[PDB]
Design an enzyme around this catalytic site. Sequence first.
Site, PDB file in Angstrom:
ATOM      1  N   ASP A  25      42.156  50.283  77.113  1.00 37.20           N
ATOM      2  CA  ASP A  25      43.050  51.336  76.701  1.00 37.20           C
ATOM      3  C   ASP A  25      43.748  51.043  75.369  1.00 37.20           C
ATOM      4  O   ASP A  25      44.795  50.477  75.362  1.00 37.20           O
ATOM      5  CB  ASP A  25      44.114  51.597  77.731  1.00 37.20           C
ATOM      6  CG  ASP A  25      44.911  52.858  77.451  1.00 37.20           C
ATOM      7  OD1 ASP A  25      44.604  53.523  76.457  1.00 37.20           O
ATOM      8  OD2 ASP A  25      45.805  53.217  78.270  1.00 37.20           O
ATOM      9  N   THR A  26      43.195  51.517  74.269  1.00 37.94           N
ATOM     10  CA  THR A  26      43.820  51.272  72.938  1.00 37.94           C
ATOM     11  C   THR A  26      45.180  51.953  72.770  1.00 37.94           C
ATOM     12  O   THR A  26      45.949  51.590  71.846  1.00 37.94           O
ATOM     13  CB  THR A  26      42.900  51.701  71.789  1.00 37.94           C
ATOM     14  OG1 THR A  26      42.533  53.102  71.920  1.00 37.94           O
ATOM     15  CG2 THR A  26      41.607  50.883  71.772  1.00 37.94           C
ATOM     16  N   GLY A  27      45.467  52.918  73.637  1.00 41.04           N
ATOM     17  CA  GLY A  27      46.739  53.627  73.682  1.00 41.04           C
ATOM     18  C   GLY A  27      47.846  52.912  74.479  1.00 41.04           C
ATOM     19  O   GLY A  27      48.952  53.471  74.619  1.00 41.04           O
TER      20      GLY A  27
END
Lengths: 99, 99
Positions: A25-27
């Site tokens: 999850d880059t967020g």
Amino acid sequence: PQITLWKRPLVTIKIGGQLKEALLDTGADDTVLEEMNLPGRWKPKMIGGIGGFIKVRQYDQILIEICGHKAIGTVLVGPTPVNIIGRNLLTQIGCTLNF
Amino acid sequence: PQITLWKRPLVTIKIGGQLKEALLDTGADDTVLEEMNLPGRWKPKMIGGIGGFIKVRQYDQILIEICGHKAIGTVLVGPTPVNIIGRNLLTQIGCTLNF
């Protein structure tokens, strides 16, 4: 490996001797997992996203395998609906976004 | 380009003639932006994440430039605190996670 995004980026993780699936999850600034006992000691923390905040338990220097790649870092545990591997550990595994 | 994750993966976007910054978010099925007028027509939608749900307005076939890369797709607008580019558009730009 190189992962594509047609499908949610769910990978196999191993933590506290248990096998789980988690979203790369880059967020996510932080790594947050469903409820689970982990070695000893925590401090309270809160995280927010879409919809506001949740209270979680912060555990430091926890060992996690992410799709074969070992990392040691901070892991949060709390009322998330999906296991999330955030940038804290994604960095350690050398994960980049490419396009 | 190849983007690293030491820092939040914020990139420049252009939509409806306006320049914005947005998070390249592998944890987002959908693209969701702060409040903004967009060509004509929408239908109601809800999205959830950490903390539960928000109501948004769904607009289809909207043109967005993401760090130079053009894409056309569905864009949601609503009470998000950060502009988020989800997998709907990340796919169109050829974005992959690599480690």
